[PDB]
Design a protein around this ligand. Structure first.
Ligand code: OZX
Ligand code: OZX
Lengths: 304, 304
């Protein structure tokens, strides 16, 4: 028992991190096979960041201007190309540590691990979620660009995020591994509107099931609700609407605990309306929404 | 910016995890050089767990009864010995992936990363602290024994914890890498008193400095306090007493923010006495105490 914000083991991803330098800018790259993926803003100086024309800026750059370093060895760049907001640097050496991998574009509400890197070296690993407003609440400093987000299925790493920006609000924006930003964000130093950060209702419910599994049952009440009644309360509290797909996804957790999804919804409804009254749930004084029903099941069953 | 419960990259430790089976019991082992370290309770059946005489139980075991598997290859055990509550299995092959390492016994209040494992395979990585009552609030299921806690200094892994037990209360107990339990716990299935779980005051203060660094300044007030006045409030709220050593350890954070330690103490004092009033600090509704002043500085400076 015990429930923790748990990240995937990062070793497979550590073996892919490299440092990419272009001119005066240094950020992280992901080395998979003979290609290094990195944010295209590696070609920009701070001056260029106001209104960059990446196509025009890229024209002034040749293969030899992209300095790629893996550990302490330099990689030879034999090709370069821009795919949306990522640069793909073709190197002459395939990464001998390339794991089995996929490039996936996740949905808002899904969770993933981030290996925060600086100068191609990993500094830490943490678990986060793609928010409904397509931002992430990471922990990133200057130089962390090119740090990636991933999920692991046994031995296959599904890369889902590459870090690009910090918005003026302190939240983070980035792309999938094809260079498409999550959300309406652009790689420009301009006023960008993040949007309402709603709570991922299905994830809160999964975490309430994790609490019951782990013995915290104080919030369980004698009431039930309907999807429509629950959603009237959920909208009022900026919670994502709960759908029948979400009820179905909570099926395994509902079965394991013997608590019907709509009964857990009524518990959540009362927690929203009355607060926690100074009490905690799994050592938290707020409702946690960065665990999916899959994360809860995985953590409570010990999938390796 | 952004502040997260961040763990060390686990790759160096993943390369050391093995599965140790003795009879019907399987748990994790740590393979460093030609020695596999594991909890001595690997020799016990559930029946033996009530009152085990490990010396007598060990006599019935020979090298060939300890099945050590690294990945899918079997390691040949050429020696075995008990050191306090750990078994050290001498194998004929040195781990080719042994990183630079140390065995250290941490103090209550210090933090470390845990690589949770099952059958020698890692499932997740999370950050935790050794509580003042010498328990840890981990996330561990049956089979996780032998999972380790560690810190990394550039390339040197300092192993500090090996998981052994879950107490009836759901908290976890374990040893350092010499087999000495943290706290008064014994590897026996008996009624064991964890003790008062106090709050690590110096860590709360460090996290308050991290909040100011990251822009959350609502809790900063116009007051100051003294160590003795602060401690009168701290004892009332089961907070660890704050000493001049702790004030000194917060020096760098105090300098970076321009907020004197005793002024942050007065802020903490008012947060304790008045509560958060439904507000959050770094996305938390309670005072976080699992970040040391070193963790805060490391995260805010990007040490790799
Ligand atoms: O945001 C940028 C650079 C940038 C500026 C404008 C547009 C684009 Cl695409 N990229 N880098 C950072 C990322 N994450 C965290 C940071 C923390 C401090 C300073 C920079 C940080
Ligand atoms: O506590 C034990 C086995 C045990 C029993 C008595 C004494 C000793 Cl030294 N060891 N194993 C576990 C560790 N962590 C978490 C667990 C969760 C569920 C079931 C067992 C768990």
């Amino acid at each position: 028992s015990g429930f923790r914000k748990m990240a995937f083991p990062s070793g497979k991803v550590e073996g892919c991190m490299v440092q990419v330098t272009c001119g005066t800018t240094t950020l992280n790259g992901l080395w998979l096979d003979d290609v290094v993926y990195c944010p295209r803003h590696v070609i920009c100086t701070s001056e260029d960041m106001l209104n960059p024309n990446y196509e025009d800026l890229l024209i002034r750059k040749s293969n030899h201007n992209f300095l790629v370093q893996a550990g302490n060895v330099q990689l030879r760049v034999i090709g370069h190309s821009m795919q949306n907001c990522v640069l793909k640097l073709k190197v002459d050496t395939a990464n001998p540590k390339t794991p089995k991998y996929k490039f996936v574009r996740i949905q808002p509400g899904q969770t993933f691990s981030v290996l925060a890197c600086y100068n191609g070296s990993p500094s830490g690993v943490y678990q986060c979620a793609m928010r409904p407003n397509f931002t992430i609440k990471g922990s990133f400093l200057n130089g962390s660009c090119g740090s990636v987000g991933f999920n692991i299925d046994y031995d296959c790493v599904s890369f889902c995020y590459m870090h690009h920006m910090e918005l003026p609000t302190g939240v983070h924006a980035g792309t999938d591994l094809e260079g498409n930003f999550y959300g309406p964000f652009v790689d420009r130093q301009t006023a960008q509107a993040a949007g309402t950060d709603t709570t991922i209702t299905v994830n809160v419910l999964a975490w309430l099931y994790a609490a019951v599994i782990n013995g915290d049952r104080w919030f369980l009440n004698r009431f039930t609700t309907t999807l429509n009644d629950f959603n009237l309360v959920a909208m009022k509290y900026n919670y994502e609407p709960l759908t029948q797909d979400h009820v179905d996804i909570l099926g395994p957790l509902s079965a394991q605990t013997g608590i019907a999804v709509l009964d857990m919804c009524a518990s959540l409804k009362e927690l929203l309306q009355n607060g926690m009254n100074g009490r905690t749930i799994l050592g938290s004084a707020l409702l946690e929404d960065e665990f999916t029903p899959f994360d809860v099941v995985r953590q409570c069953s010990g999938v390796t």
